[PDB]
Write a protein that binds this ligand. Sequence first.
Ligand SMILES: *C(=O)[C@@H](NC(=O)/C(=N\OC(C)(C)C(=O)O)c1csc(N)n1)[C@H](C)NS(=O)(=O)O
Length: 261
Amino acid sequence: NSVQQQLEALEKSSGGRLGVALINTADNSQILYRADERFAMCSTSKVMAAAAVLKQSESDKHLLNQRVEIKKSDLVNYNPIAEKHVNGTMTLAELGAAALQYSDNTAMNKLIAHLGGPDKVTAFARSLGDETFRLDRTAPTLNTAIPGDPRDTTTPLAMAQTLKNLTLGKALAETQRAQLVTWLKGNTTGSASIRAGLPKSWVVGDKTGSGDYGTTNDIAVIWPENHAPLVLVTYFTQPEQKAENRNDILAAAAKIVTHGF
Ligand SMILES: *C(=O)[C@@H](NC(=O)/C(=N\OC(C)(C)C(=O)O)c1csc(N)n1)[C@H](C)NS(=O)(=O)O
């Protein structure tokens, strides 16, 4: 069957709401599925906050090396990296790395506090042409992912275009661009999501995100071995609050749309 029908069948059987947006930079073609609908980003929004910090460094060559104090009071629900540097310091380059690679929520909160609140992260998204992205809360409350709640949401299509600009396009300067890709490529939390649906040979840099309502997300940039890069967004959410997180569904969705590449 077609790509569309397989996703509908996957959604109908999963008992949830599935969002997909793939961009083939080869011909700028698109595979869409509920790509104009709002989903809760969860911890995928961390790519924006880090990118916002990277953009500042284009005008300040001493910003990323700037230390940041990590108090015991700054710790929240999940932070495997920041818990090690209590009563110590971590540079923004380390905060940025931890936020994306290990999904450290404290590091994420340090980047926002530095920028000047979630509104500053949103204003940064606007400068890139993204009229859809919005960030209203810090971590971990930004992962509530309540149905119908517009806070901390964006559409699959908007993020794919922005993520494409950030890693392959004109959003950042080259040095800053290569740094973001380096971080995404070194992600340790997405082995079971989109990567599990692709050939193991393909190079992949992604950012996952999990929250309540079985909300399970993954945004990724893909480099084929003999083709132009791909940009894939896979959002998924369920109607009941304490649903299980389904990364296997994101793995299935990636294999369905990437079928042929
Ligand atoms: C971002 O999405 C962030 N998610 C969370 O911290 C929450 N849960 O994650 C854990 C690992 C605890 C889980 O078992 O689901 C969460 C649920 S509700 C809420 N208000 N926060 C994590 C850290 N990032 S991710 O990309 O690794 O999933």
